[PDB]
Amino acid sequence: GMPQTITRGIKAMLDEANSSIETLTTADAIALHKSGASDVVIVDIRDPREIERDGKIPGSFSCTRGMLEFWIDPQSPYAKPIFQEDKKFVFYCAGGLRSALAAKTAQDMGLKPVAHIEGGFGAWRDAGGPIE
């Protein structure tokens, strides 16, 4: 049968996100973490099975990407108070792509300031960043 026709793909979504958000270099993110990450919340948006396999950034807060809006919005029944804090929110995933979309979503909602980690946890690990 005729296949599905995708007319808006990840390329378009990622371009829109990337040009609107801070992409924090892996090295800068690692340095930020080592400084104590004052007034920063590092948000791990990976599936828990990814986290179990590969580990995580120490002290990061887990919120899967698919739940993000529901935990950010204070008017959501599922609101998490951490997202109301007067801090910079740095999102990360495995390779940097989901987290660009997540940062853009959060920014679109009004969360400010936001960023994501270039190359994700994969790049973090490759650089020898802190891992739990």
Contacts with Na ion, residue ranges (CB under 5 A): 18, 23
**Burial class (CB within 10 angstroms; exposed 0-12, middle 13-18, buried 19+) of 13:** middle
Shortest distance, position 93 Cβ to Na ion, whole Å? 16
Residue with smallest beta-carbon separation from Na ion: 23
CB 74 within 8 A of CB 26: no
Closest CB to Na ion among residues 33, 116: 116
Closest CB to Na ion among residues 71, 96: 96
Shortest distance, position 21 Cβ to Na ion, whole Å? 5
Shortest distance, position 34 Cβ to Na ion, whole Å? 23
Closest CB to Na ion among residues 23, 107: 23
Shortest distance, position 1 Cβ to Na ion, whole Å? 40
Closest CB to Na ion among residues 14, 79: 14
- Measured CA to CA, the distance from residue 77 to residue 75 in angstroms comes to 7
